[PDB]
Write an enzyme that holds these catalytic residues in place. Structure first.
Site, PDB file in Angstrom:
ATOM      1  CD  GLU A  35      10.278  16.699 -14.003  1.00 17.81           C
ATOM      2  OE1 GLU A  35       9.700  15.650 -14.346  1.00 17.81           O
ATOM      3  OE2 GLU A  35       9.673  17.790 -13.925  1.00 17.81           O
ATOM      4  CG  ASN A  46       2.906  11.478 -19.775  1.00 20.13           C
ATOM      5  OD1 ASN A  46       2.970  11.510 -18.544  1.00 20.13           O
ATOM      6  ND2 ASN A  46       3.894  11.914 -20.557  1.00 20.13           N
ATOM      7  CG  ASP A  49       0.003  13.452 -23.981  1.00 23.83           C
ATOM      8  OD1 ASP A  49       0.506  12.619 -23.205  1.00 23.83           O
ATOM      9  OD2 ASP A  49       0.673  14.334 -24.549  1.00 23.83           O
ATOM     10  CG  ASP A  53       7.295  12.889 -19.327  1.00 22.50           C
ATOM     11  OD1 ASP A  53       7.229  13.677 -20.292  1.00 22.50           O
ATOM     12  OD2 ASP A  53       6.396  12.773 -18.471  1.00 22.50           O
ATOM     13  CG  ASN A  60       6.158  15.153 -23.473  1.00 20.24           C
ATOM     14  OD1 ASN A  60       5.659  15.414 -24.560  1.00 20.24           O
ATOM     15  ND2 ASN A  60       5.568  14.359 -22.585  1.00 20.24           N
TER      16      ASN A  60
END
Length: 130
Positions: A35, A46, A49, A53, A60
């Site tokens: 990650e 991101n 949308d 993160d 998120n």
């Protein structure tokens, strides 16, 4: 902060992640590795949308923490996303614990399925003394 492997392993064990909700320490290490590369200040927007993160576990902003600019978001960990960017991993761990309390468990992170699930993850904790 960028943790060294064994340093992080020992830290996570002290914070009680070993076996949390049936999840072994090596699985959490494999997750953090893929990650963020064990980096607490890692952030990833991101564009698709409008969520971001945050931190070592790349949690998120739509479901877990509040950053104020994510549409229709909830804050299940009841934390500012800022708390997930500290060098002190306590809050990120408390929030990661919340995420796995949901039915999906560790599967909530797609990276875990891709890079950790059904694999030999011993290498992540080998020689760390945990």
């Amino acid at each position: 902060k960028v943790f060294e492997r064994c340093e992080l392993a020992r830290t996570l064990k002290r914070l009680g992640m070993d076996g949390y909700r049936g999840i072994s320490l090596a699985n959490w290490m494999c997750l953090a590795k893929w990650e963020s590369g064990y980096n607490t200040r890692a952030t990833n927007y991101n564009a698709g949308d409008r969520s971001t993160d945050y931190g070592i576990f790349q949690i998120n902003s739509r479901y877990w923490c509040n950053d104020g600019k994510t549409p229709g978001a909830v804050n299940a960990c009841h934390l500012s996303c800022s708390a997930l960017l500290q060098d002190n991993a306590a809050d990120a761990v408390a929030c990661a614990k919340r995420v796995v309390r949901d039915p999906q468990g560790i599967r909530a992170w797609v990276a875990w399925r891709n890079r950790c699930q059904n694999r030999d993850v011993r290498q992540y904790v080998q020689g760390c003394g945990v």
